[PDB]
């Protein structure tokens, strides 16, 4: 545009004001681009920090949606689509009554995560059998525990709780005390396999 304007006006000294205005606008644009290039590292590091801050929420969203989708294994009536979870996410992000006046970014993130879990559970369980509410709550609790920081993974404990209870330990099942029954004694033997229960 500068080139065509210059060759249209032939660089007249009377057209100098119009030429100079365009030239200084171009210089301003070039200075803005140069500032952007000279600050690439700072902007990239800031974006990386923000992405690291918001990563756990995204991981929680993905885990929640895929648990929702695999919910079809329990019952044929638990068919949930991607649009359903997208609606849940947009509802918690935008139509959040708990975010009416919250301004602190970390506080908004915490509120968003908590209300995401709550709203997902409510909307999924409104159309789920009453005997399966506790299962979905347990799954969301596990997702939250995986996403939360400062806590052990409890991988061994959960594995024993779910599948580790059925392991061959029938040999040497002492009656223990009169209160303990044979099945309770076997359960004690199985649970004592864990290091935290070795003195059971």
């Amino acid at each position: 545009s500068l080139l065509q304007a210059l060759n249209e006006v032939k660089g007249r000294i009377l057209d100098d004001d119009t030429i100079i205005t365009t030239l200084e606008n171009l210089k301003r644009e070039a200075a803005e681009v140069t500032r952007k290039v000279e600050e690439t590292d700072i902007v990239m590091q800031e974006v990386e920090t923000v992405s690291q801050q918001y990563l756990p929420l995204s991981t929680a969203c993905s885990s929640i949606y895929f648990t929702m989708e695999s919910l079809k294994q329990i019952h044929f009536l638990y068919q949930y689509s991607l649009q359903f979870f997208l609606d849940i996410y947009h509802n918690v992000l935008y139509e959040n009554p708990n975010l009416k006046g919250v301004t602190d970014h970390t506080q908004r993130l915490s509120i968003i995560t908590k209300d995401l879990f709550q709203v997902a559970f409510n909307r999924v369980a409104r159309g789920m059998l009453h005997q399966d509410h506790i299962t979905f709550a347990m799954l969301l609790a596990r997702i939250k525990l995986k996403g939360t920081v400062g806590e052990p993974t409890y991988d061994a404990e959960f594995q024993h709780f779910l599948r580790g209870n059925e392991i061959v330990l029938s040999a040497g099942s002492t009656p223990r005390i009169q209160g303990l029954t044979v099945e309770q004694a076997e359960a004690v033997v199985r649970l004592s396999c864990l290091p935290a229960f070795k003195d059971l």
Partner: protein, 49 residues
């Protein structure tokens, strides 16, 4: 090659402005802007390289 064509064309315009000079403030501002323009395009050719 577009950049080189622009360089040649505005060198021609610089010669034309030098011929037309002999308002003085207009000429001085034009020369200053042309010099900034020249250094900018030297940088642009370097970044194209």
């Amino acid at each position: 090659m577009h950049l080189n064509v622009g360089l040649r064309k505005i060198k021609e315009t610089v010669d034309q402005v030098e011929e037309l000079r002999r308002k003085v403030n207009r000429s001085t501002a034009l020369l200053k802007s042309l010099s900034a323009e020249r250094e900018r395009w030297e940088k642009t050719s370097e970044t194209f390289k």
